[PDB]
């Protein structure tokens, strides 16, 4: 099972927690640009992907992709203080969240 | 097999376009409070729900839920100039967008 | 059972209440142009259609189509302060109200 | 039962009340031009028609068709202050009232 | 069982503690350029590799790769005061941490 | 094969090169205190130990423990500018070099 | 074969060259105190020992122990400019050279 977890941080004060378990041929990528961005990502889904990109300051993301197969996550937060929380369990399914600006809130649930 | 689509406007200058076709056992609800809020919503998903509530001024929402089953979409825009675009094709899934404040932008795509 | 309920509002201060239940293969359409127009429309009839058009200011319509089949109801209110009250329960039946001008009152019941 | 109720009002201050019940394959039509004309028309007869035409001001009409079949009732009031009172219950029968000018009163009963 | 642990230190004030136990056909490499960089690396995984490179000043790294097989760790800290903490126990898995700038904190967990 | 290679540096300008290959059940330790100390150490010997201690400034040590078994090398350099060059291939043998002061040169070979 | 070769140097500028080959259960020890002392020692004799002690300045020693068994070699040079050259090959034999003062020269051969 070729499973890859990548964390790239540029700037200062960004924090990332990542978990990949029982997750075969799947990719989890976190890329944070700027400052004070927080990420918490769990992936336990086969042939699945999670891409998290935060660019700016004070953005928060909590992502959970569990039990699914052939499933995709994209989260892109541009700006300041945006909040994202997503759970994805559906198979052959995809979730996309894109927040631009200040103070955005998004919660997504796919079963 | 009951299908309901509802529009409520309170205030002035709010505009709503709604479409429900091939959409069985499904509810689409559109409620705007205030002024200048714009909504364009399409629902063709069985056993599915759309709820958009706009409260404030200049909020814009474009919602599309097609080919899904047992799917729920909720968009709530509080304040001014919030923008939301939501696409929903997954079955047994939920999208929730909650925008608070001014100038918020959110696009959610869930397949 | 393609059931569609459409409300289009252009201008300011228009209010529409629409209800569609137990209503198969049926369309309800409300179109408001101008200002201060009030609409209350309920439809529970199979293979039926409601068409309410209000163009002007201060027009009010109360429209109820219940327990009929293959029934068409149309109200067209042009101008100011027109009042229409229409109840339709007869099957395979049509009601048509046309008001032009100011201060008109029209009552129609079809059983 | 293709039953149609039509109200056309042009001008200002005209009032029309129309009732259609148990009235199959039948037409009720009211046409008011001008101002202050009053109409009260009841229709409960199968395959039968009412045509009321009031053109002018201050004309009053009280019209009832009940329990008839294949019955035609036409009232035409041109001008000002004309009063008409017509009751029709006979089947396969026709009532025609024509008033032109000012202050005419006409009463017709057909059983 | 060819097990190699290499440490290269250039400059001054860099300190590194490295432990390799029960770790067959596996490579652990530490390379520090500059000053005041701290490293603590434990490797007990078969056919696994850990590569740590710190370039700059005041960077801190804590890396634990345990019980895995065919597992890769890459940690690269460029700049000042970066902190990294990574634990990997998953087999056939890869963790990559890259920090650029000042004051980054990165945590990686892979089981 | 529990094989551990540790280098501790306290102070500034110290440089340490260490390689451990084909070396089962063996420890290589380098400890540098002060400034500008240079060490290069290779270990390929089974059940062997390397202890290099440099305390001061400008000390240089070149240590090669190859093809031996049950072999110990200890080199201790206190002060400034000491040079030691030691090669050890003999099995069940021990080499001990102690330099105190300034400008010492010592060469040790054991086959 | 427990074979030990130890060189202890205290002071400055001391130089020692030491060779132990084919020499089982044997000890070779050099102790130099002071400055400029030179030692060159080869040991290839079984169950035998070499002890060289130089205390002072400018002392020189060339010691060769070969093909003997159960042999002991001791040279003690105290002071300045002392010279010692010793070859031992005899079995069950001991050579002892003691030089005190300045400018002493001693040659020992035992076959």
XYZ file of C-alpha atoms in Angstrom:
777
model
C 0.000 0.000 0.000
C 1.735 3.145 -1.293
C 0.464 5.690 1.248
C 2.009 9.163 1.441
C 1.571 11.899 4.053
C 3.193 15.243 3.214
C 3.377 18.421 5.310
C 4.855 21.654 3.923
C 4.939 24.781 6.099
C 6.122 28.230 4.980
C 6.162 31.260 7.243
C 5.635 31.192 10.991
C 3.438 29.696 13.695
C 1.429 27.279 11.546
C 0.445 23.992 13.196
C -0.486 20.711 11.530
C -1.585 17.363 12.954
C -1.950 14.522 10.459
C -3.119 10.904 10.775
C -3.219 8.159 8.133
C -4.173 4.632 9.211
C -5.531 1.551 7.404
C -5.431 3.843 4.384
C -4.144 2.032 1.297
C -2.900 3.730 -1.896
C -4.000 7.091 -0.528
C -2.444 10.555 -0.290
C -2.734 13.186 2.452
C -1.122 16.569 1.723
C -1.050 19.686 3.922
C 0.471 22.932 2.630
C 0.384 26.036 4.831
C 1.591 29.487 3.750
C 1.705 32.403 6.161
C 0.977 32.344 9.868
C -1.072 30.838 12.667
C -2.913 28.360 10.445
C -4.144 25.199 12.156
C -4.871 21.842 10.556
C -6.090 18.503 11.934
C -6.510 15.776 9.309
C -7.490 12.114 9.633
C -7.586 9.710 6.681
C -8.526 6.037 6.870
C -9.969 5.464 3.397
C -8.681 3.275 0.580
C -7.563 4.797 -2.736
C -8.534 8.207 -1.371
C -7.009 11.670 -1.251
C -7.015 14.700 1.036
C -5.468 17.998 -0.107
C -5.412 20.883 2.382
C -4.018 24.277 1.363
C -4.132 27.299 3.665
C -2.732 30.639 2.484
C -2.905 33.555 4.909
C -3.335 33.834 8.674
C -5.404 32.198 11.395
C -7.242 29.684 9.212
C -8.513 26.504 10.873
C -9.282 23.139 9.287
C -10.517 19.811 10.660
C -10.867 17.051 8.057
C -11.912 13.417 8.541
C -12.093 11.010 5.575
C -13.107 7.593 6.921
C -14.462 4.243 5.658
C -14.779 5.523 2.076
C -13.168 4.306 -1.135
C -12.172 6.213 -4.286
C -12.944 9.399 -2.354
C -11.475 12.895 -2.643
C -11.003 15.903 -0.358
C -9.935 19.384 -1.413
C -9.891 22.261 1.092
C -8.490 25.654 0.087
C -8.599 28.547 2.565
C -7.363 31.946 1.355
C -7.207 34.914 3.709
C -7.802 35.243 7.426
C -9.629 33.369 10.154
C -11.551 30.967 7.916
C -12.990 27.840 9.499
C -13.541 24.442 7.858
C -14.842 21.170 9.325
C -15.597 18.177 7.086
C -16.409 14.493 7.533
C -16.454 12.278 4.416
C -17.467 8.603 4.483
C -19.152 8.100 1.092
C -17.445 5.908 -1.497
C -16.673 7.012 -5.060
C -17.333 10.514 -3.750
C -15.653 13.926 -3.622
C -15.901 17.008 -1.376
C -14.525 20.465 -2.255
C -14.399 23.439 0.127
C -12.987 26.809 -0.952
C -13.095 29.832 1.354
C -11.900 33.308 0.372
C -11.736 36.324 2.655
C -12.141 36.758 6.417
C -14.212 34.794 8.907
C -15.673 32.126 6.623
C -17.325 29.053 8.163
C -17.886 25.799 6.269
C -18.958 22.345 7.454
C -19.387 19.449 5.027
C -20.738 15.960 5.731
C -20.722 13.170 3.143
C -22.054 9.744 4.093
C -44.676 11.180 -3.719
C -44.775 14.766 -2.501
C -42.437 17.459 -3.774
C -42.445 20.939 -2.215
C -40.547 24.089 -3.128
C -41.147 27.189 -0.999
C -40.157 30.860 -1.314
C -40.536 33.482 1.435
C -39.437 37.116 1.062
C -39.497 39.683 3.868
C -38.294 43.191 3.100
C -37.396 44.625 -0.279
C -35.452 43.967 -3.470
C -34.893 40.254 -2.857
C -34.917 38.013 -5.936
C -35.349 34.250 -6.235
C -35.170 31.783 -9.119
C -36.152 28.217 -8.268
C -36.291 24.987 -10.290
C -37.406 21.525 -9.154
C -37.619 18.794 -11.814
C -37.449 14.972 -11.718
C -37.157 15.535 -7.978
C -39.285 13.140 -5.942
C -40.014 13.228 -2.187
C -37.905 16.366 -1.936
C -38.201 19.812 -0.358
C -36.521 23.031 -1.495
C -36.973 25.997 0.865
C -35.874 29.572 0.167
C -36.205 32.269 2.840
C -34.835 35.819 2.544
C -34.978 38.573 5.178
C -33.804 42.076 4.328
C -32.781 43.447 0.963
C -31.073 42.760 -2.341
C -30.556 39.064 -1.616
C -30.292 36.927 -4.743
C -30.924 33.204 -5.029
C -30.813 30.739 -7.927
C -31.549 27.145 -6.945
C -31.957 23.905 -8.903
C -33.011 20.586 -7.371
C -33.391 17.343 -9.306
C -32.458 14.863 -6.582
C -34.773 12.261 -5.088
C -35.519 12.188 -1.348
C -33.367 15.297 -0.979
C -33.565 18.681 0.719
C -32.351 22.198 -0.042
C -32.655 25.009 2.498
C -31.246 28.470 1.844
C -31.765 31.211 4.425
C -30.432 34.679 3.606
C -30.660 37.358 6.309
C -29.219 40.783 5.553
C -28.303 42.646 2.377
C -26.647 41.786 -0.926
C -26.220 38.073 -0.230
C -25.938 35.845 -3.295
C -26.439 32.094 -3.562
C -26.372 29.661 -6.480
C -27.360 26.157 -5.386
C -27.526 23.011 -7.523
C -28.436 19.520 -6.259
C -28.662 17.057 -9.159
C -28.713 13.260 -9.526
C -28.291 12.698 -5.787
C -30.472 10.691 -3.430
C -31.088 11.137 0.303
C -28.977 14.306 0.177
C -29.251 17.492 2.250
C -27.959 20.979 1.405
C -28.188 23.906 3.844
C -26.839 27.396 3.129
C -27.205 30.233 5.641
C -25.926 33.723 4.797
C -25.980 36.308 7.605
C -24.867 39.868 6.943
C -23.808 41.673 3.798
C -22.458 40.716 0.393
C -21.908 37.034 1.173
C -21.397 34.789 -1.835
C -22.126 31.057 -2.013
C -21.993 28.554 -4.872
C -22.882 24.941 -4.048
C -22.901 21.851 -6.286
C -24.300 18.518 -5.046
C -24.345 15.222 -6.939
C -23.485 12.734 -4.170
C -26.110 10.478 -2.620
C -26.612 10.156 1.146
C -24.594 13.357 1.662
C -24.905 16.822 3.211
C -23.475 20.252 2.375
C -23.595 23.018 4.986
C -22.389 26.545 4.263
C -22.695 29.173 6.984
C -21.401 32.639 6.119
C -21.305 35.384 8.740
C -20.295 38.978 8.188
C -19.357 40.968 5.092
C -17.776 39.929 1.809
C -17.571 36.213 2.571
C -17.040 33.868 -0.386
C -17.652 30.119 -0.321
C -17.831 27.506 -3.058
C -18.645 23.929 -2.086
C -18.558 21.048 -4.557
C -19.525 17.588 -3.343
C -19.711 14.766 -5.880
C -44.254 13.491 -10.547
C -42.509 16.596 -11.760
C -43.797 19.134 -9.271
C -42.431 22.642 -9.585
C -43.203 25.726 -7.529
C -41.678 28.907 -8.941
C -41.737 32.429 -7.514
C -40.040 35.313 -9.352
C -39.857 38.749 -7.709
C -38.668 41.958 -9.380
C -38.655 45.313 -7.619
C -39.199 45.896 -3.915
C -41.440 45.001 -0.982
C -43.234 42.097 -2.664
C -44.165 39.124 -0.484
C -45.201 35.627 -1.536
C -46.356 32.651 0.519
C -46.570 29.393 -1.425
C -47.527 25.868 -0.331
C -47.600 22.698 -2.453
C -48.485 19.387 -0.794
C -49.907 16.068 -2.045
C -49.770 17.764 -5.437
C -48.506 15.527 -8.245
C -47.611 16.455 -11.840
C -48.445 20.042 -10.986
C -46.900 23.497 -11.303
C -47.419 26.638 -9.223
C -46.001 29.902 -10.614
C -45.983 33.337 -8.947
C -44.500 36.371 -10.707
C -44.354 39.780 -8.999
C -43.252 42.987 -10.728
C -43.130 46.291 -8.891
C -43.847 46.900 -5.232
C -45.838 45.877 -2.178
C -47.618 42.976 -3.871
C -48.870 40.215 -1.587
C -49.576 36.623 -2.563
C -50.809 33.581 -0.631
C -51.141 30.459 -2.797
C -51.836 26.849 -1.793
C -51.973 23.883 -4.182
C -52.872 20.295 -3.330
C -54.374 19.130 -6.621
C -53.027 16.528 -9.028
C -52.159 17.364 -12.645
C -53.038 20.983 -11.901
C -51.526 24.412 -12.453
C -51.603 27.777 -10.693
C -50.400 30.946 -12.430
C -50.417 34.194 -10.427
C -49.030 37.324 -12.087
C -48.995 40.627 -10.207
C -47.612 43.705 -11.982
C -47.832 47.053 -10.209
C -48.208 48.046 -6.560
C -50.248 46.947 -3.555
C -51.970 44.007 -5.241
C -53.144 41.139 -3.043
C -54.152 37.621 -4.037
C -55.350 34.628 -2.018
C -55.405 31.482 -4.152
C -56.309 27.939 -3.074
C -56.537 24.932 -5.420
C -57.425 21.775 -3.482
C -58.683 18.242 -4.211
C -59.160 18.922 -7.927
C -57.551 17.179 -10.880
C -56.475 18.482 -14.305
C -57.389 21.976 -13.095
C -55.952 25.347 -14.124
C -56.147 28.578 -12.134
C -54.874 31.939 -13.425
C -54.895 35.387 -11.787
C -53.489 38.477 -13.522
C -53.483 41.717 -11.521
C -52.260 44.845 -13.322
C -52.088 48.166 -11.511
C -52.707 49.128 -7.909
C -54.480 47.804 -4.838
C -56.336 44.986 -6.583
C -57.697 42.187 -4.430
C -58.436 38.655 -5.626
C -59.750 35.656 -3.690
C -60.008 32.344 -5.563
C -60.869 28.867 -4.284
C -60.961 25.935 -6.716
C -61.885 22.354 -5.821
C -63.676 21.261 -9.007
C -61.867 18.728 -11.171
C -60.991 19.346 -14.826
C -61.832 23.008 -14.271
C -60.359 26.446 -14.925
C -60.594 29.757 -13.080
C -59.377 32.987 -14.685
C -59.310 36.338 -12.873
C -58.108 39.460 -14.675
C -58.021 42.778 -12.841
C -56.751 45.982 -14.432
C -56.644 49.343 -12.699
C -57.032 50.480 -9.091
C -59.033 49.170 -6.144
C -60.668 46.219 -7.896
C -61.998 43.327 -5.810
C -62.784 39.927 -7.337
C -64.061 36.741 -5.695
C -64.191 33.361 -7.447
C -65.129 29.951 -6.045
C -65.316 26.773 -8.127
C -66.477 23.479 -6.614
C -66.123 19.172 -16.205
C -64.495 22.052 -18.126
C -65.883 25.007 -16.159
C -64.440 28.505 -16.600
C -64.876 31.686 -14.554
C -63.710 34.943 -16.140
C -63.535 38.435 -14.638
C -62.293 41.363 -16.731
C -62.252 44.792 -15.088
C -60.973 47.937 -16.815
C -60.901 51.350 -15.178
C -61.560 52.061 -11.523
C -63.870 51.192 -8.643
C -65.711 48.317 -10.324
C -66.672 45.401 -8.083
C -67.554 41.854 -9.120
C -68.489 38.816 -7.043
C -68.967 35.501 -8.837
C -69.721 32.008 -7.534
C -69.599 28.780 -9.554
C -70.562 25.507 -7.866
C -71.761 22.079 -9.057
C -71.573 23.722 -12.472
C -70.091 21.402 -15.086
C -68.882 22.337 -18.587
C -70.044 25.911 -18.057
C -68.802 29.467 -18.550
C -69.292 32.501 -16.303
C -67.972 35.777 -17.744
C -68.081 39.300 -16.282
C -66.772 42.269 -18.288
C -66.784 45.709 -16.651
C -65.496 48.849 -18.372
C -65.375 52.176 -16.566
C -66.218 52.891 -12.951
C -68.415 52.051 -9.982
C -70.242 49.164 -11.654
C -71.337 46.371 -9.320
C -71.942 42.736 -10.216
C -73.088 39.723 -8.186
C -73.452 36.525 -10.203
C -74.085 32.923 -9.138
C -73.797 29.953 -11.492
C -74.822 26.407 -10.638
C -76.138 24.924 -13.891
C -74.581 22.349 -16.195
C -73.434 23.073 -19.759
C -74.699 26.634 -19.392
C -73.336 30.169 -19.649
C -73.535 33.665 -18.165
C -72.234 36.728 -19.996
C -72.493 40.039 -18.125
C -71.263 43.196 -19.866
C -71.343 46.532 -18.036
C -69.811 49.504 -19.848
C -69.957 52.838 -18.030
C -70.638 53.959 -14.457
C -72.945 53.103 -11.566
C -74.577 50.073 -13.187
C -75.704 47.244 -10.902
C -76.393 43.608 -11.757
C -77.764 40.704 -9.710
C -77.668 37.473 -11.704
C -78.372 33.874 -10.693
C -78.563 30.674 -12.749
C -79.445 27.578 -10.721
C -80.498 23.969 -11.431
C -80.733 24.547 -15.190
C -79.036 22.769 -18.075
C -77.969 24.083 -21.490
C -79.054 27.582 -20.470
C -77.742 30.932 -21.691
C -78.096 34.217 -19.805
C -76.738 37.502 -21.184
C -77.049 40.970 -19.631
C -75.704 44.100 -21.337
C -75.840 47.424 -19.471
C -74.413 50.427 -21.327
C -74.221 53.779 -19.581
C -75.024 54.929 -16.075
C -77.011 53.714 -13.092
C -78.678 50.734 -14.764
C -80.061 47.991 -12.546
C -80.669 44.385 -13.602
C -82.053 41.458 -11.590
C -82.313 38.084 -13.348
C -83.012 34.589 -12.007
C -82.898 31.588 -14.353
C -83.683 27.978 -13.456
C -85.284 26.702 -16.682
C -83.312 24.269 -18.825
C -82.688 24.767 -22.552
C -83.713 28.399 -22.057
C -82.261 31.827 -22.819
C -82.499 35.162 -21.000
C -81.353 38.375 -22.697
C -81.417 41.744 -20.923
C -80.308 44.921 -22.700
C -80.278 48.299 -20.950
C -78.905 51.432 -22.604
C -78.740 54.858 -21.009
C -79.336 56.111 -17.472
C -81.443 54.795 -14.605
C -82.946 51.740 -16.294
C -84.224 48.911 -14.093
C -84.982 45.473 -15.548
C -86.197 42.328 -13.782
C -86.335 38.912 -15.458
C -87.313 35.535 -14.008
C -87.352 32.325 -16.047
C -88.405 29.040 -14.453
C 21.873 -6.647 8.313
C 23.613 -3.483 7.079
C 22.572 -0.681 9.439
C 24.185 2.747 9.061
C 23.841 5.835 11.267
C 25.607 8.966 10.009
C 25.888 12.380 11.683
C 27.525 15.395 10.006
C 27.800 18.644 11.982
C 29.104 21.894 10.471
C 29.377 25.104 12.451
C 28.789 25.375 16.170
C 26.424 24.560 19.012
C 24.541 21.826 17.176
C 23.712 18.750 19.257
C 22.293 15.422 18.109
C 21.286 12.231 19.903
C 20.647 9.231 17.654
C 19.564 5.688 18.530
C 19.268 2.728 16.155
C 18.173 -0.597 17.650
C 16.683 -3.807 16.210
C 16.808 -1.896 12.932
C 18.008 -4.044 10.025
C 19.061 -2.785 6.570
C 18.132 0.739 7.605
C 19.768 4.160 7.329
C 19.562 7.091 9.756
C 21.240 10.332 8.641
C 21.579 13.629 10.537
C 23.169 16.690 8.921
C 23.272 20.042 10.723
C 24.593 23.263 9.177
C 24.928 26.433 11.208
C 24.286 26.807 14.905
C 22.286 25.784 17.947
C 20.304 23.079 16.153
C 19.043 20.175 18.254
C 18.195 16.687 17.030
C 16.830 13.564 18.745
C 16.204 10.578 16.459
C 15.157 7.015 17.294
C 14.915 4.328 14.615
C 13.846 0.744 15.222
C 12.304 -0.154 11.869
C 13.493 -2.686 9.317
C 14.396 -1.625 5.767
C 13.577 1.955 6.751
C 15.257 5.330 6.374
C 15.317 8.591 8.317
C 16.927 11.699 6.805
C 17.188 14.848 8.939
C 18.730 18.048 7.570
C 18.764 21.301 9.533
C 20.262 24.416 7.936
C 20.303 27.608 9.981
C 20.020 28.322 13.704
C 17.999 27.173 16.701
C 16.056 24.421 14.938
C 14.769 21.449 16.937
C 13.818 17.995 15.685
C 12.388 14.933 17.430
C 11.920 11.930 15.135
C 10.762 8.419 16.072
C 10.340 5.660 13.469
C 9.336 2.471 15.271
C 8.006 -0.983 14.362
C 7.618 -0.032 10.702
C 8.931 -1.758 7.609
C 9.886 -0.152 4.285
C 9.194 3.260 5.836
C 10.746 6.632 4.965
C 11.162 9.822 7.016
C 12.408 13.089 5.519
C 12.711 16.212 7.686
C 14.257 19.425 6.355
C 14.320 22.626 8.421
C 15.659 25.797 6.780
C 16.019 28.991 8.778
C 15.589 29.713 12.457
C 13.813 28.305 15.486
C 11.831 25.634 13.646
C 10.417 22.754 15.659
C 9.495 19.333 14.268
C 8.049 16.290 16.042
C 7.296 13.193 13.962
C 6.259 9.656 14.909
C 5.903 6.946 12.252
C 4.881 3.348 12.931
C 3.112 2.508 9.648
C 4.751 0.150 7.170
C 5.230 0.949 3.469
C 4.588 4.606 4.318
C 6.369 7.941 3.913
C 6.428 11.128 6.001
C 7.891 14.363 4.617
C 8.261 17.516 6.725
C 9.753 20.662 5.197
C 9.840 23.930 7.134
C 11.111 27.220 5.720
C 11.594 30.435 7.653
C 11.326 31.277 11.356
C 9.290 29.782 14.180
C 7.540 26.917 12.404
C 6.089 24.063 14.459
C 5.252 20.822 12.665
C 3.808 17.628 14.113
C 3.386 14.451 12.077
C 1.812 11.164 13.185
C 1.573 8.089 10.964
C 0.465 4.720 12.321
C 22.397 -5.850 15.676
C 22.049 -3.090 18.270
C 24.395 -0.489 16.757
C 24.482 3.049 18.151
C 26.493 6.045 16.961
C 26.265 9.240 19.035
C 28.015 12.595 18.690
C 27.511 15.354 21.274
C 28.906 18.847 20.649
C 28.892 21.675 23.201
C 30.234 25.092 22.262
C 31.078 26.288 18.765
C 32.938 25.433 15.562
C 33.258 21.705 16.255
C 33.049 19.311 13.308
C 32.468 15.569 13.447
C 32.443 12.935 10.700
C 31.212 9.475 11.667
C 30.422 6.360 9.629
C 29.180 2.990 10.899
C 28.856 0.153 8.365
C 29.092 -3.658 8.580
C 29.314 -3.043 12.330
C 27.096 -5.277 14.485
C 26.559 -4.933 18.227
C 28.878 -1.946 18.481
C 28.860 1.626 19.786
C 30.643 4.704 18.425
C 30.594 7.819 20.631
C 32.166 11.237 20.004
C 31.963 14.009 22.614
C 33.357 17.466 21.811
C 33.463 20.340 24.313
C 34.690 23.800 23.369
C 35.628 25.033 19.924
C 37.103 24.106 16.560
C 37.632 20.421 17.345
C 37.738 18.118 14.329
C 36.988 14.409 14.360
C 36.693 11.761 11.644
C 35.756 8.233 12.747
C 34.914 5.061 10.808
C 33.677 1.839 12.409
C 33.197 -1.501 10.678
C 34.097 -3.915 13.479
C 31.841 -6.383 15.267
C 31.249 -6.176 19.025
C 33.526 -3.136 19.167
C 33.468 0.268 20.814
C 34.743 3.738 19.968
C 34.998 6.523 22.543
C 36.451 9.843 21.404
C 36.516 12.744 23.862
C 37.819 16.173 22.856
C 37.723 18.994 25.408
C 39.248 22.328 24.426
C 40.089 23.939 21.090
C 41.619 22.924 17.768
C 42.001 19.220 18.548
C 42.071 16.761 15.651
C 41.371 13.029 15.687
C 41.309 10.409 12.921
C 40.027 6.996 14.030
C 39.522 3.873 11.909
C 38.317 0.615 13.501
C 37.979 -2.007 10.768
C 37.656 -5.803 10.487
C 38.243 -6.317 14.212
C 36.121 -8.091 16.791
C 35.768 -7.455 20.533
C 37.931 -4.355 20.112
C 37.911 -1.052 22.010
C 39.393 2.324 21.062
C 39.481 5.275 23.477
C 41.065 8.598 22.502
C 41.015 11.551 24.912
C 42.305 15.008 23.929
C 42.425 17.775 26.550
C 43.613 21.248 25.617
C 44.619 22.808 22.327
C 45.789 21.674 18.910
C 46.336 18.013 19.786
C 46.548 15.543 16.928
C 45.810 11.814 17.106
C 45.709 9.251 14.285
C 44.699 5.709 15.258
C 43.988 2.622 13.127
C 42.759 -0.608 14.739
C 42.176 -3.933 12.978
C 43.313 -6.459 15.614
C 40.671 -8.518 17.394
C 40.337 -8.789 21.185
C 42.531 -5.694 21.487
C 42.342 -2.226 23.039
C 43.913 1.095 22.023
C 44.080 4.007 24.474
C 45.475 7.429 23.543
C 45.618 10.277 26.066
C 46.830 13.756 25.092
C 47.000 16.658 27.539
C 48.168 20.160 26.725
C 49.067 21.922 23.480
C 50.429 20.656 20.172
C 50.672 16.933 20.916
C 50.835 14.450 18.046
C 50.261 10.734 18.620
C 49.934 7.917 16.087
C 48.655 4.463 17.045
C 48.326 1.396 14.817
C 47.135 -2.028 15.969
C 46.773 -4.914 13.515
C 44.670 -13.856 21.921
C 44.295 -11.002 24.428
C 46.758 -8.456 23.019
C 46.839 -4.888 24.351
C 48.814 -1.898 23.074
C 48.653 1.261 25.194
C 50.393 4.598 24.629
C 50.214 7.348 27.262
C 51.715 10.768 26.515
C 51.758 13.710 28.934
C 53.215 17.097 28.081
C 54.144 18.325 24.623
C 55.629 17.191 21.322
C 55.838 13.490 22.206
C 55.666 10.981 19.356
C 55.057 7.236 19.491
C 54.868 4.649 16.708
C 53.586 1.240 17.787
C 53.090 -2.058 15.942
C 51.700 -5.331 17.312
C 51.322 -8.289 14.933
C 51.172 -12.098 15.307
C 51.664 -11.434 19.020
C 49.308 -13.426 21.261
C 48.481 -12.770 24.932
C 50.989 -9.929 24.975
C 51.116 -6.338 26.224
C 52.963 -3.342 24.760
C 52.962 -0.141 26.834
C 54.616 3.237 26.221
C 54.576 5.976 28.866
C 56.108 9.329 27.906
C 56.224 12.302 30.282
C 57.620 15.665 29.247
C 58.696 16.787 25.803
C 60.131 15.748 22.455
C 60.260 12.063 23.381
C 60.380 9.633 20.470
C 59.346 5.986 20.516
C 59.243 3.332 17.780
C 58.214 -0.142 18.948
C 57.368 -3.400 17.168
C 56.037 -6.468 18.994
C 55.604 -9.908 17.438
C 56.585 -12.318 20.238
C 54.300 -14.695 22.069
C 53.209 -14.346 25.709
C 55.615 -11.444 26.156
C 55.554 -7.839 27.339
C 57.078 -4.475 26.419
C 57.300 -1.551 28.841
C 58.943 1.682 27.692
C 59.096 4.606 30.128
C 60.565 7.949 29.074
C 60.470 10.827 31.561
C 62.087 14.082 30.478
C 63.095 15.688 27.188
C 64.612 14.579 23.890
C 64.642 10.885 24.787
C 64.699 8.401 21.917
C 63.798 4.710 21.892
C 63.751 2.089 19.130
C 62.454 -1.248 20.416
C 61.905 -4.472 18.459
C 60.693 -7.729 20.038
C 60.397 -10.620 17.575
C 60.201 -14.438 17.494
C 60.668 -14.837 21.256
C 58.339 -16.384 23.813
C 57.752 -15.647 27.506
C 60.000 -12.597 27.237
C 59.978 -9.256 29.045
C 61.468 -6.012 27.746
C 61.831 -2.865 29.872
C 63.535 0.440 29.076
C 63.506 3.376 31.508
C 65.032 6.681 30.368
C 65.116 9.598 32.820
C 66.452 12.998 31.816
C 67.677 14.415 28.527
C 69.030 13.241 25.189
C 69.078 9.575 26.193
C 69.245 7.000 23.431
C 67.989 3.402 23.531
C 68.019 0.765 20.787
C 66.909 -2.752 21.738
C 66.315 -5.952 19.757
C 65.047 -9.092 21.503
C 64.475 -12.517 19.954
C 65.546 -14.893 22.758
C 62.932 -17.042 24.483
C 62.254 -17.054 28.239
C 64.477 -13.983 28.482
C 64.318 -10.465 29.908
C 66.162 -7.293 28.897
C 66.256 -4.256 31.194
C 67.918 -0.964 30.251
C 68.040 1.981 32.662
C 69.487 5.350 31.636
C 69.622 8.375 33.935
C 71.001 11.801 33.103
C 72.073 13.479 29.859
C 73.549 12.104 26.641
C 73.328 8.414 27.536
C 73.372 5.842 24.725
C 72.411 2.188 25.222
C 72.221 -0.691 22.744
C 70.796 -4.063 23.781
C 70.555 -7.211 21.663
C 69.362 -10.565 22.993
C 69.217 -13.633 20.753
